[PDB]
Amino acid sequence: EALLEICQRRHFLSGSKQQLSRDSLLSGCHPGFGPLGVELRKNLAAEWWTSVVVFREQVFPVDALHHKPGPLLPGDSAFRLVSAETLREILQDKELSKEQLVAFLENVLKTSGKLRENLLHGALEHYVNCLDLVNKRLPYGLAQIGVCFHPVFVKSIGEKTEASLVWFTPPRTSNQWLDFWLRHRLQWWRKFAMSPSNFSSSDCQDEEGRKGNKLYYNFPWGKELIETLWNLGDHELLHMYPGNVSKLHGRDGRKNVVPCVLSVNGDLDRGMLAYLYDSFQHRKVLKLHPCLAPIKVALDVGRGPTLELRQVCQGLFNELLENGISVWPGYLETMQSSLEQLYSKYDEMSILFTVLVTETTLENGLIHLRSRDTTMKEMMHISKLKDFLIKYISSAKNV
Amino acid sequence: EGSEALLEICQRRHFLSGSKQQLSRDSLLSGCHPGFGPLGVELRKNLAAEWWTSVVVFREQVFPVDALHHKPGPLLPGDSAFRLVSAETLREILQDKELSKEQLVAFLENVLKTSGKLRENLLHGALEHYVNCLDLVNKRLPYGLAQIGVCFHPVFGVKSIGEKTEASLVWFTPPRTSNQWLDFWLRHRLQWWRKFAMSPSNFSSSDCQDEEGRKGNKLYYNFPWGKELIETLWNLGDHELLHMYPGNVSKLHGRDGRKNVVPCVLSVNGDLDRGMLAYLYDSFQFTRKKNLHRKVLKLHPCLAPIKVALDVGRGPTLELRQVCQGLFNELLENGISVWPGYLETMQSSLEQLYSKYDEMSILFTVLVTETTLENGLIHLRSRDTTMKEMMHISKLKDFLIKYISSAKNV
Amino acid sequence: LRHNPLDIQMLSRGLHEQIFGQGGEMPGEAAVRRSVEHLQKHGLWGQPAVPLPDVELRLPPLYGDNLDQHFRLLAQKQSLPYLEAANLLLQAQLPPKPPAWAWAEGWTRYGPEGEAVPVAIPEERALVFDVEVCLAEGTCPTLAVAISPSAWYSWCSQRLVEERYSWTSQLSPADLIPLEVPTDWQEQLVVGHNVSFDRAHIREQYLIQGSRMRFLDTMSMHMAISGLSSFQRSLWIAAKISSWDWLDISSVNSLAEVHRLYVGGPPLEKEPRELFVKGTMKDIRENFQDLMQYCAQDVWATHEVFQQQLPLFLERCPHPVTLAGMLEMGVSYLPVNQNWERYLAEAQGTYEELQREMKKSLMDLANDACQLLSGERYKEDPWLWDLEWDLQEFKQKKLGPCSEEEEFQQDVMARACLQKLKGTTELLPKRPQHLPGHPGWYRKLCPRLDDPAWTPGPSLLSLQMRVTPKLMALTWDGFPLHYSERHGWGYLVPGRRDNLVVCPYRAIESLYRKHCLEQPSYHHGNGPYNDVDIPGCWFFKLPHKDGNSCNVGSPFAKDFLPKMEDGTLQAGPGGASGPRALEINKMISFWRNAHKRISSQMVVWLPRSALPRAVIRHPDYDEEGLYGAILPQVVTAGTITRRAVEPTWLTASNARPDRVGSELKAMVQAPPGYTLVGADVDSQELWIAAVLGDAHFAGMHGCTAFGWMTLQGRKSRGTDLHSKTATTVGISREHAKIFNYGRIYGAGQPFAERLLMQFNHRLTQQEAAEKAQQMYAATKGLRWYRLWKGGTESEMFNKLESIATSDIPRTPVLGCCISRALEPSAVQEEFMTSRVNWVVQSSAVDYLHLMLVAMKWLFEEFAIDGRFCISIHDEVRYLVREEDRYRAALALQITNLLTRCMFAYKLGLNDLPQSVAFFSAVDIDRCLRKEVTMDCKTPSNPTGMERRYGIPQGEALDIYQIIELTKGSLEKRS
């Protein structure tokens, strides 16, 4: 309760107190996130992109579209892109009103578009073209982050943003690569945690018999699924490309073989909620990890000649932004609050540091610094604060 | 002519995707092509990050927003387009299977009343957040909301979906300032577009009046067949906000100076996929022209997708490979994108590699040799000059960081 | 009388009665017939007259017998307290300079025995004053020294004595020097050298109401006595034609040479290290005593110079009007508001974007040209074949595995390999080499990596560099440009055997053959100089606006833009690029030269408690606005003609479309409840020359043909000056305008024969010489009457040469002497045209002084609430509270009338033509403009003044509208 109430008050979530419910957030049909949630998600996504893609010479981004055209496979209860305009188009004449009420069901099941359910199929549609980029060397990957659409339960739409990697491999080594990716993904989820024992893994088996793994986070009410790994084999590539298999071959061991497909997919909105709960563990504060927290530092102004203090705050604000530090410009508010409320507000926003500029800054350049973690206060000279902050961020990242 | 030679290059170096038949002008302009190749995806990501830098990062009072892709709930009847209907929900006229005949048209009201729609613009969902986000700035009336995302457009054996990536600012202004802010943002965005252009005279604006007679501006790029629209600005006034929120206007008031007013909405919306295509046409194409046949894409350093090529000379393979791995890890740890050319067995001559990298628009080729293991000097070729220089390996990182960081200030 | 002889309309009955006596005199019958027959031989004796409406006024009471007595009494009353204060400085007995300079903040007064005492203000009637400024810190005053008749004084800035992390960069009067006293005769005089700079640092000088204080400048009194011509300046410096006697009595304007001439003794010493212009505040704190010593030294030398100069000035310009004029010229005042900052920002941004657009286009050409190095292909390019195409050597000192295991080991392995190879830096030379593998020409275009202003590429390139037109492959009439070291820019014409290094006779021949396919010698104009010795070609100069002997310094100059649009000058990269580059150059040329001066103007912002109540209690007042002023640093006499000089405001361009900066002046904006009123003298110098010619010939207005034409040519008949010139020989009236203005400054047959050739290409040189001969016979006549006479203008030139040949030339109206450095004793017949022009220019300066004296009188007499704003040689402006704005226009018109009548009186003419008596209009405006209706749209403010700032247009009123606004009275009762 309290955590979500605070997250609504401080613009992590969006909507209203009636719409705020955990089951809706899990289902992906809540009203949406606030700006702080957007920034937090962008941080998660960039740390995922750097961890998975950047340092790999053979993982490439892929551009799957949001919908599938053409004729579907019938008998699926799922969304259709169909229009009442086309209901007047089909009636090119009035007299087509024959058996039409059942028949039109089979027609809309035959000729309509579909929303994207997963990123896998869009990646598989590019395999033959992207094989040229690696000079057909068989092990390579495609990665994408994007929203997918899921039927809920008068059904409604769940929206989920998902991070996906598809890894192609010789079948000889598939289970080794599976164990490797399980190791990396689990340790990636553990790095930023304040209690990494709350992240867990399990073995599981497909109804076929194929081997897979599942990753969980222990929310206060129970474990929830966050990410899944499956060794899918080769069925889908053959089904998507009947006929002359020799276009499917790449090179392993100086010989042609059909690759095996590994699928890795994680839900980032789940991850966001997991870290929000993890950070919250008499004071209250959200101790988000320094790499993830959306706004690093707040600037304020003390008592004195406002027009002089504001121009130096402006200079400091621009100095911090030029070096890539995100800043909350509290100095616009004229510090109408008492300092107790100002600290409580910043502790709930998970701000790392707060800087007060005062007459004495104009005298000698000393600013007050507070740290969110320690609640300790010290003086520092304005000249050096930027390099202190860069140091603190690097010494967080390298541990 | 020139245009097809350009599209030959763009597919062969994987900026575009799909066959010739899928890449005609109409398909690209409509947004129903198969998609962009990986270099195009990186080019678009760079363009979007430059846009985010110029619009949001330095702008003390703009904030991000996240409008959903679909509209839930009940909807106005008579809008023509596709809706999220299903064969499962179709049974609400099939309660008796023997019903039939041209009486069916009743079911149009059912499908209109209770089926969702895919969003067509970003403004409406931003306006849904006005009341809530006005708290962020203590009602101080100049504030903005920005986001980037895909939009869906009906185009025309019957129908197809266009997908377009768009970037939108919604800016709230006290009514007297509205034309001042219009002129401000018009100049700002037109200079932003011209900044990266190689021929900024090919960008232009004109004044327009809507069918109701509200003022606005349109920005065009002069493709080789004619102008195409790339961005639009409107002063919309207050009516849409009033319609969204009927009743006590006291909820809507913000603070202007010391007096309380309802703002004019300013709307800014630009097309990023057309932006990408415009810069692609810009970057390409009198004896200094008649005899420099060289093919190259002069993409701006902030935009060009791949910055450095790494290659090896002939020599002790393990030593060169370990030093190239060191270089590669150092460069990537500082955010410079690199092509691992040292991993493809060197079938080509140097001339062929230079041609390939110039088609890919790569900024710099770095070459490692036997002599580097002794003196630590590496060769560097400039894309822009084709001249070769020697540089010591200890400084390369800082040189590249300087070159890119200062490219903003050229 | 309604008319005089020759039936020209004359001053109104009541006006002439009020101004002149009824006594008068008759010209004489012989003078009349001498005039009429002269007008007969020229064809002027037929009347186009259109009688102007008569006008009547009750003028303010004059003083004494006649208008000269009146103006003397006026100027004596204005000046007396300051000449009184000045006489106290001629007899001061200065104590010894104090042994140790005091450290404290503010003002300290020193007793004998050197005892420093703190005093809030110097409390003195007369002072010599000097201010020092640390240039690194900005514009705040740093320290100063003053001397009175009885004590030494010194001042310290708080920014020098204290230490702080920051001070406000916006200036306040609280950070300027206090000088004038609280509410003795107490009409303070301050004297200095370049005193206006010291004036700029005085806090009370910025208040919107006036002050008693006035300023006198040693440099301007030097310029009056023995100031040198600008050419004499360079001669005098080269000496450190044949008379050379003037050099011993003259000098340059610097304080050292002025002390040397007037005082002598041991030379003055400068500080060698120049701490105030090049040091930093730490150095000022450390070197304190030495700096304050050098300041007292310059102060003492200024006091010594002043005592010598004043009796000579009082001798050579005895009429009090001159001194009163100079003393009023020293108090200009320009109001400004917060729009100034926005104007500066918008100008800088627009200049930057246009310069970036130009640089990008040149940089792409520079980049692509590097490809000509391969295969030595550059040897065949008819441009660039002669650049430095050299390269400088670099200088030394003498499968299918699984996932990995122990990835952390391969990581540390590669990192340690890289650190090991990184450490070999010890073998590099200490000085980093600069682009040795790029060509030398390209090498020069690129900054060094050490420069804090480095950018990638060849970003130093400009249109005005000699390389640039070779890159654009500029062509003239089909021929490639070439630069000659002797002769500047020209072009190469191919085709010459007998040679009259790989390019010769080959590539250029082909290129021109191609041009001729697309459409002795075969070409003419600035004909072939065999001094330049390119094989195969001939070299021709580009033509210059000033004729063949000037050198063209850049083809991008304005004067070539017509030939670009005509298609005579062309670029290679195609028909859009050439004219666009020329457009941009025209757009930015003014801002390039002036932006440092303009942006570093010193501005002081007035707080709430300082403003008038008529501002704060006004409907148009705003909170969060800014109000302030700029004080121009005018030198009251900077020229041999004694004109004012100022580095910025006297050369400010008028608002123009397609010029980026032009709205500079329109940013001077009256505060709420105040207004600008002023006017511009119509055709001043032509009238002065005409009336001098009339006074010399026969003592009647319009007795000479040039005088009549100046008064009676109405453009519709063929009878104005320019129509007549265009009638004597077949040229357009617009060309005759040029010939006339040239001839007035003393041009002769070389000037006219040149312009003739330059306006009709069919003319032979003999025809031009003959037509010039005839034009000069018609205009000025023949040089003597035997074996000037017989021209429309002869008597004016006779009179001017008469004045200039006198043993002591004096200005005809007010009697100021010319400079000793130009009297015929020191200079036999050198500098003759300067001496002739001086008569008119100095007369116009006397006219300016008379107008200033009259306006100060009428404002103090009718208690008008207004202030002098600025003047620009022939304009005056006044800042006025809006309630008096219509009375001010009447005072201006009365001043114009009294000035015009005074001028004629000293020439011995007792009347004035009715047409010149008043300003054609008076301007009432909220900002400064050349015309009242101009909206001043520019590329830097395309929406114009009325939309960006809401300043409306104003009113332009003739005398009659001022009457119907005022009923003809200046009384506050109306």
Add this chain to the structure above:
DNA sequence: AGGTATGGCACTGGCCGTCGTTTT
């Protein structure tokens, strides 16, 4: 015998400094 002033940039030659090569 075209007048009086202001000021900018591009270019050239002369001079002192210091770092690397030939030396007590």
Add this chain to the structure above:
DNA sequence: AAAACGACGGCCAGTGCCATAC
């Protein structure tokens, strides 16, 4: 290992030309 010198790049003053004003 202190001391001698030579070549080269950096700094400034001076000359030339173009741009503003009346």
